[PDB]
Symmetry: D2
Subunit: 266 residues, 4 copies
């Protein structure tokens, strides 16, 4: 008669998978992912930090761009994550196997990473990826220092329970630049009200808008560059139109309020 | 010359290890631990729930008291935890091996349980116990239902990041009784201010006092019975002097404020 | 220019995904999977055992067939595995979430199951599935007893390092029937000689042929029924043409020797 | 009346905990543990390898001896283990937190390490230590290369299921030296015959004696130095009386046969 359906692969827009050469953000900070997925390399005298890796199939491209920057596999020391979905943490397990890198994450992100994104609060098993273990668990406001660059975790639960903004200070043209890598604030197809798997979802999103609003934020970057109006294909103008953290938070909250109203009507 | 020190066992007051027979709290709820450590058995037509197990060496005693109540190993379905320290989650791994029980916990408690209490934010490796895996991760406010008894999680971070109050409604003399099993609110020898492993420790404790204050709470129980003025050795009067949740929260906050002042002076 | 390739789903022949009603093998043993993937239910007075679950998307079908047999989710006590590939262990994580079941497996199978089949010795990350944790680790020759049916593990490394045959005695028409659920002995596209990830692959396969040859084996079943000449769609004749364990082992060894010769020539 | 017993710490002979300065074994290989527990440092131009760490409380001493050798925490790349008992893998979790090191182990050792030595086949929970995760799973005969030194795994199951000998070639006075770090072959207080948790224990020990007998073995070292007649406190003569691998295997087999006979009589 009728067989069960075949497994469906997690397929994405081509631009999410379009390799790009490294794009400099500040003196030690580079976008080394694809056109439409952020993966940030921070290079220090004492090794390199990667914030996000994009999709699972991006591991070799990331290692190629690291080599182009002078970062060998042994030199990658630390992987940080915005959140542990397949399109941002996808290649972490493979990167750990192929480099010296260790993962630092909060408890929520660590348990989602360790089950490869399975049993997602909203997506079920529809978006899984190879599982990986965290080497260090971080708390809200905790700092990690690599080669003198100080990364601070700012929890901003909502998109996932473990969603995190990472902030650090780099330099540009001599001057300090406070960089904020703020996580997604979207709720794509989520049940927002009365969700039994996430009862305080709305309150957490509201607190997260306030957290993002208040980040030290000379330059905002986001896991999906379009969310902060970056255009990685635009070269010297890639960041010209970027939002402030305040504008990103306001836009996300306005969208969220509309979704709440639509959910009530639906 | 001088050898490194021997490992030091986690030793406790004798009363913490003094077995007691089951003590009834409500129609389906029993204290089945020791004189000075709580372990709550909730018996339903569809299996039993255990909230905490005490110290690691209490597993066989717990199974004996379950058998006395008519609960076989296959009948124990669910283990819930206040927090994942050795004196409350100690026997969980062994209980999982010897019973049908699965563990539900929040992400913070799950990651501490999975490392057996090692790398504790405050105690280091001084209080370790056999590690166990959680089978279900719960979110704040999430409910779990067993045989018609509904358990609600209320996160109250502080004593550990994953500290949780569990509430449920049982009956007594016909009438509903709202039971609150509130976690510890102590901070024993903790560095409270400017703690790099727990930067928002103080704000979390303050929020947790407010959470405990507001619990549905006809009867308060705590992992250390003395914290809520229970005397499990006092028979029919065991709960006569028990605090309200409001009084427990107020007392813990007053103690906390004194500790803050002492830390500033020290 | 050219984006990285999209993730490719693990797609299989339709017959592997074709639901079937329960097919009785012996008094307490039933095939409850699909036409072309084995999933064995063994029903005892003290709960049920599942050996394999097939593909990830088979969980609900398995639970439906269990209900048809009188097995509720709380009644499923134990999941055993032939090997931890996606087409045999696929739905284990979901089954653990939805039932009382605990998993027993050897160390090799447990570590592959815990990474969801990622970093496979031969397939890489091409065939991943939701990860699950084992509750009990078994050694070679160890027995597990459920409701009086005794399951014995016989390690038969090769197809995976953790490949296992499970044997038990059921009854039929009054008489004992020694059932052997022998794992796959295939090496599909494997590098057999000088494989750096599996240096003793050939010796392990040779020992495994001998193990299978010697199993107590009135009735042979295999994870892919065609490997032992079962036809689950053939009703009362489903097992009529089934191989002996000796014939299955001999056929697998002859195929293996041919593959070795082809590899040398290639 | 009578409380349950206090937890008992894993206490050991003082010499096991007696720090020693680094003792050179070959051009790049050093004993950096204690008088009576081996911990081998292998220094390469591309980072350092540690084989075993001894007891849990030895982590800081090991890091001190590494610094004395010119090995900083970032320079430690790889930890290998003989077997995952507390007196040999004790400090691995802490070393991973404090260094760049990743752990490679076989599946059996990895699952025992991940439960901190709890639920030991023979010792139960009597000898637990902080759990750690393996970063790479190795198969029998697999090689790992660091800075041009090639380490080969030789499984020798018995003392634990995952017991491993590691062999590598260093140099001395110009000439190659084949070093064999063979695991324990003891069975202290073990039930050898008919052990339900280890049914093939005897056959595995017999095979392991043969494996050890056949190792490439110009210099034998063992986790307990006394087992191979090393005296780490004897300076230039520390290794003068060391056994061959053949003599170590023969002595262990003779002791094993005596224990079997005593078990039959007991
Ligand atoms: C798991 O990944 C996501 N789901 C999918 O891929 C397919 S299912 C939902 C849909 N539809 C998710 O988490 O929902 C992506 N990640 C999001 C994020 O915010 O991280 C959103 C990005 S919206 C955006 N903002 N700027 N550009 N784009 C494209 C949705 S897409
Ligand atoms: C890991 O266990 C604890 N530490 C120790 O055992 C020894 S070290 C700290 C000291 N000293 C811990 O967590 O600090 C205990 N658990 C506490 C709790 O609140 O859970 C406190 C209970 S104070 C109390 N209230 N009523 N009765 N008692 C005795 C301290 S004792
Ligand atoms: C991960 O799953 C397997 N690979 C794939 O699905 C696609 S890639 C290899 C190819 N091609 C695998 O392990 O190789 C399957 N499982 C096998 C087994 O023996 O378990 C073999 C079964 S051959 C057979 N014997 N009777 N019927 N069939 C169909 C191959 S198919
Ligand atoms: C977990 O650790 C062991 N047990 C204990 O510590 C206390 S209980 C058993 C007793 N008694 C174990 O595994 O049994 C040690 N490790 C052994 C090994 O072979 O690894 C043996 C070493 S005998 C030796 N050979 N040369 N010197 N020594 C002292 C026994 S001692
Ligand atoms: Zn996402
Ligand atoms: Zn996304
Ligand atoms: Zn505590
Ligand atoms: Zn306590
Ligand atoms: Zn397979
Ligand atoms: Zn298969
Ligand atoms: Zn040992
Ligand atoms: Zn030892």
């Amino acid at each position: 008669e009728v067989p069960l359906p075949q497994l469906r692969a997690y397929t994405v827009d081509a631009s999410w998978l379009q390799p790009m050469a490294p794009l400099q953000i500040a003196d030690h900070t580079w976008q080394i992912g694809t056109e439409d997925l952020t993966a940030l390399l921070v290079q220090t005298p004492d090794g390199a930090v990667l914030l996000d890796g994009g999709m699972p199939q991006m591991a070799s491209h990331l290692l190629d761009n690291m080599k182009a920057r002078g970062v060998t596999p042994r030199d990658l020391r630390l992987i940080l994550l915005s959140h542990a979905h397949a399109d941002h943490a996808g290649p972490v397990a493979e990167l750990k196997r192929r480099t010296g890198a260790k993962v630092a994450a909060n408890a929520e992100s660590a348990v989602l990473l360790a089950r490869g994104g399975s049993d997602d609060l909203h997506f079920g098993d529809g978006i899984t990826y190879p599982p990986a273990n965290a080497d260090r668990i971080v708390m809200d406001g905790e700092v990690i220092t690599v080669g003198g660059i100080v990364f601070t975790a700012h929890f901003m639960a909502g998109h996932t329970p473990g969603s995190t903004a990472w902030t650090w200070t780099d330099t540009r043209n001599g001057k300090p630049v406070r960089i904020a890598y703020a996580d997604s604030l979207s709720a794509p197809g989520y049940q927002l009200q009365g969700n039994p798997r996430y009862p305080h979802l709305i309150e957490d999103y509201r607190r997260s808008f306030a957290t993002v609003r208040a980040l030290p934020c000379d330059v905002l970057l986001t896991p999906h560059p379009g969310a902060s109006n970056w255009d990685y294909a635009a070269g010297a103008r890639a960041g010209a139109k970027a939002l402030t953290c305040k504008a990103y938070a306001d836009a996300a909250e306005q969208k969220f309020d509309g979704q709440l109203a639509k959910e009530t009507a639906g």
